[PDB]
Design a protein around this ligand. Structure first.
Ligand SMILES: Nc1ncnc2c1ncn2[C@@H]1O[C@H](COP(=O)(O)OP(=O)(O)NP(=O)(O)O)[C@@H](O)[C@H]1O
Ligand SMILES: [Mg+2]
Lengths: 299, 17, 568
């Protein structure tokens, strides 16, 4: 199994192109990165028009030779970490799936399955129905629902990538001394980041990019997104992490910091999520809260 | 061969960059 | 067999002919070794081996044709260039088999991507028209230029005589009209295009071709002429016909300056004096608006259509010629060829009927003998006309002066009338400008620079690049604050139109106002429409609407509309 985004569905080319690790290793947000991918497939001996075919229909010979082709070629691109072992399951004649693909299907179903207090209640009630839309997909009798989950997973990753490139190309990351700050004031559709899990997927994209872009300055990061209906920013505090191939674990300290500023502050804020690293605050109060936060020694 | 080194350098820059 | 020749040993052709010397095994092996040694070793002055950099990009695009410049091959190992010019059909076989070795040195197992590579020659240093070809040119490499008159469909062709195929297509090439001598008809030739070269060119393009000149027996020619006369053909080897950050920064620099709209209009049609409103309308049509659609019952075009009523000799045909050279793609008189471009009409029942359908739709549909098919128009129309005989009559409304149906005047965004008015000072200004331009054009670098900068306030190369950039990049939108005022002005104009008994203003005019405001925003690279854009659009449309009316109605309109046509 390969750390490639949904290999056995869509195509081999899309598997590399949307992989969260490959983007950090080859810088796919710009053309000098994309050309490296074209160059790789040309050297590997795979015709580029076949690499884009649906992986079920891709030719049998390439399918069986792929396991050796990677051993000869990933080293030249510094990309050897793609290779690993994992668990695969199959039932009758309906074809294989790995656990890594299964969990992406389930998370996608959680995210996208189908004055202020009432709207918040409606939203939080909608998110609970998706629990049962995911629960009913753990049954082999209901593979039909699992396929829908996979179709949603692909669109979610597409929309995430199309926001990440905008953040990096417009250089919206602000490099403060103690931590890195990023705030989304507008977007193609900013509603997708109103759910916590989607926001964390975007954060995990940016964290891989920041982890590989320079050897220096492993820093905490703060990410926020506005909502036009509440006029509140949804804020999340994220740790750094060490690369895949490299020894105690680090700890997320934003919890105590957000709690202390919340205990002190004039600001209109909410803390009720299980994960205390995520908070919410009104439009005008973001800047004084972040000012008091950076003035604090708790970061 | 030294004269053809520029060719192989252009090939090796794919490894480097 | 084992021993090889030196390059100096090839200086003497030892057999009775070139082809019978190239085809010998020791000579051929020597040529192969030398070509490979050139391709692995040639450099820029900066080192930076170009062919190692081209083979690299061959795989990056999954391509099939390597391109070699003839001047490089003539700059060292000159004898190989001479042999290539004399015997291309042999030399290129050897060169192709060397190019595959060189590409596999970068990309092993590239044979699985494509089985065979073709070398394309460029910059061959001598040129013929279709006059100078003679029998001595047979089987020699030649370089030729002309216009592509006719093109066949693409077909597969059997490669070997287990089976394999390749693509095939034939093109007819004709002498360009500027090259043909006076009082003579143009000549023709026919070109064969193979695997990688099919659909490289379109009918009516002006094209440049390198290839082998070749001949064969034909029974019908011999039968009709009564002499042993062979037929000839050209087998093509190669065929020939964006911006940087610096350009973007320069565009943004000039757009940040005040009055850029006025400067763009001033740069429009430099050779023609006066007629600023016509230049304004033409600029607006060339930039255009944004198309929109609402699947709930409505759609709005981005194109802007303009009609100009011209007195005899008031510069109409010259500005159409100017637009034809300025614009990116266009048709002059066929609407298929005008797709996403500008269409030009300089004079004027089935033609009008076609235009009726074209103005109502944005796409054309037709059926014939039970067949059904569709085509796209998607274009801006600029038209001009002569007002129902020798002279326009200002005492009458527009309909009396034209041969058009009423919906035509409804659906044109902008209407304007141009007249040869009498004024001694204007006549003197025109005459001085005309004789000055006449002297400045006389056949008898610094002179050109002075001439150019006196001609226009913007260099027109930058203006054409700017228009293309703005059209491809900029997509403006309205601001919701001042639209209440626009609705009030619309209602006021309608009330005033009814009050004087005028033909009423309509939703088409309001749509045109918004579209013209978008175009004005696009002209300065602004993604927002602004109040001054709406003001200018309102002035243009209101003045155009006023010009269509009878004289008494015109006076009442301008007396009331003063707070729109002049004030705001
Ligand atoms: N600034 C100018 N103003 C008016 N006429 C000009 C100007 N400069 C040149 N001309 C000449 O005047 C004519 C411009 O009008 P134009 O419409 O091109 O002529 P025309 O086509 O023969 N008249 P028409 O057949 O009714 O369109 C041409 O003969 C030009 O050479
Ligand atoms: Mg004319």
């Amino acid at each position: 199994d390969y750390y490639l985004f949904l290999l056995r569905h869509s195509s081999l080319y899309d598997s590399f192109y949307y992989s969260n690790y490959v983007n950090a290793k080859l810088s796919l947000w710009n053309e000098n990165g994309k050309k490296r991918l074209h160059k790789m497939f040309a050297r590997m001996g795979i015709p580029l028009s076949t690499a884009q075919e649906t992986w079920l229909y891709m030719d049998h010979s390439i399918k069986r030779e792929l396991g050796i082709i990677f051993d000869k070629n990933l080293d030249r691109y510094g990309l050897q970490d793609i290779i690993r072992d994992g668990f695969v399951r199959t039932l009758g004649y309906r074809g294989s799936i790995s656990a890594s693909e299964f969990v992406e299907a389930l998370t996608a179903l959680l995210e996208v399955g189908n004055n202020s207090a009432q709207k918040l209640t409606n939203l939080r009630k909608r998110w609970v129905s998706n629990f049962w839309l995911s629960w009913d997909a753990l049954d082999d009798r209901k593979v039909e629902l699992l396929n829908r989950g996979i179709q949603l997973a692909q669109d979610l990753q597409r929309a995430i990538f199309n926001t990440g490139v905008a953040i990096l190309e417009k250089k919206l990351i602000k490099h403060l001394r103690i931590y890195r700050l990023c705030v989304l004031q507008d977007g193609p559709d900013l509603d997708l980041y109103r759910n916590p899990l989607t926001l964390l997927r975007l954060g995990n994209w940016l964290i891989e990019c920041c982890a590989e872009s320079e050897d220096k300055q492993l820093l905490p990061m703060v990410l926020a997104s506005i909502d036009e209906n509440t006029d509140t920013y949804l804020v999340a505090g994220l740790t750094p992490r060490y690369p895949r191939g490299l020894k105690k674990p680090i700890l997320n300290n934003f919890s105590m910091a957000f709690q202390q500023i919340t205990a002190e502050t004039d600001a209109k804020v909410r803390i009720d999520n299980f994960e205390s690293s995520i908070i919410e605050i009104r439009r005008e109060d973001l800047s004084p809260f972040l000012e008091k936060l950076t003035l604090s020694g708790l970061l | 061969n030294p004269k053809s080194s520029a060719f192989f350098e252009s090939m090796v820059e794919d490894i480097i960059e | 067999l084992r021993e090889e020749l030196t390059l100096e040993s090839l200086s003497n052709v030892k057999a009775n002919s070139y082809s019978e010397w190239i085809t010998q095994p020791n000579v051929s092996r020597t040529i192969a070794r030398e070509l490979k040694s050139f391709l692995l070793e040639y450099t820029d002055e900066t080192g930076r081996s170009v062919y190692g950099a081209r083979i690299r990009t061959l795989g990056e695009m999954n391509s099939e044709s390597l391109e070699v410049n003839y001047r490089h091959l003539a700059e060292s190992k000159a004898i190989l260039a001479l042999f290539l010019a004399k015997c291309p059909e042999e030399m290129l076989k050897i060169f192709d088999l060397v190019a595959m070795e060189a590409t596999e040195l970068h990309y092993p197992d590239y044979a699985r991507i494509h089985s065979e590579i073709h070398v394309r020659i460029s910059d061959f240093p001598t040129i013929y028209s279709l006059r100078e070809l003679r029998e001595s040119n047979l089987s020699s490499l030649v370089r030729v230029t002309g216009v592509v008159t006719r093109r066949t469909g693409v077909f597969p062709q059997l490669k070997y005589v287990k089976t394999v195929y390749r693509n095939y297509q034939r093109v007819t090439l004709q002498e360009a009209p500027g090259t043909v001598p006076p009082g003579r008809l143009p000549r023709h030739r026919e070109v064969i295009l193979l695997a990688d070269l099919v659909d490289v060119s379109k009918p009516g393009e002006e094209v440049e071709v390198t290839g082998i000149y070749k001949n064969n027996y034909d029974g019908n020619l011999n039968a009709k002429n009564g002499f042993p006369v062979f037929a000839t053909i050209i087998e093509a080897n190669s065929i020939k016909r964006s911006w940087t950050e610096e350009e973007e920064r320069e565009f943004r620099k000039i757009s940040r300056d005040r009055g850029i709209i006025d400067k763009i209009i001033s740069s429009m049609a430099p050779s023609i004096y006066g007629h600023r409103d016509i230049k304004t309308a033409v600029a607006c049509s060339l930039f255009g608006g944004v198309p929109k659609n609402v699947n709930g019952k409505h759609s709005i075009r981005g194109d802007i259509n303009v009609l100009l009523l011209g007195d005899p000799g008031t510069a109409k045909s010259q500005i159409l010629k100017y637009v034809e050279k300025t614009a990116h793609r266009a048709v002059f008189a066929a609407l298929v060829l005008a797709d996403k471009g500008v269409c030009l009409i300089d004079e004027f029942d089935q033609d009008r009927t076609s235009i009726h359908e074209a103005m109502e739709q944005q796409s054309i549909s037709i059926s014939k003998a039970g067949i059904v098919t569709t085509l796209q128009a998607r274009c801006s129309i600029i038209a001009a006309a002569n007002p129902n005989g020798g002279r326009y009559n200002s005492t009458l409304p527009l309909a009396q002066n034209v041969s058009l149906t009423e919906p035509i005047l409804s659906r044109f965004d902008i209407l304007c009338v141009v007249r040869d008015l009498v004024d001694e000072e204007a006549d003197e200004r025109l005459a001085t400008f005309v004789v000055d331009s006449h002297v400045r054009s006389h056949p008898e670098l610094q002179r050109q620079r002075k001439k150019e900068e006196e001609i226009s306030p913007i260099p027109q190369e930058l203006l054409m690049k700017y228009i293309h950039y703005a059209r491809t990049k900029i997509y403006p939108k309205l601001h919701q604050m001042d639209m209440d005022k626009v609705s009030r002005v619309y209602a006021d104009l309608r009330r005033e139109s009814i009050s004087t008994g005028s033909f009423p203003i309509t939703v088409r005019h309001l749509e045109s106002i918004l579209r013209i405001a978008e175009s004005f925003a696009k002209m300065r690279l602004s993604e927002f429409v602004s109040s001054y854009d709406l003001d200018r659009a309102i002035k243009v449309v209101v003045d155009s609407f006023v010009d269509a009316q009878k004289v008494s109605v015109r006076r009442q309109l301008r007396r009331s509309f003063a707070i729109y046509t002049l004030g705001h």
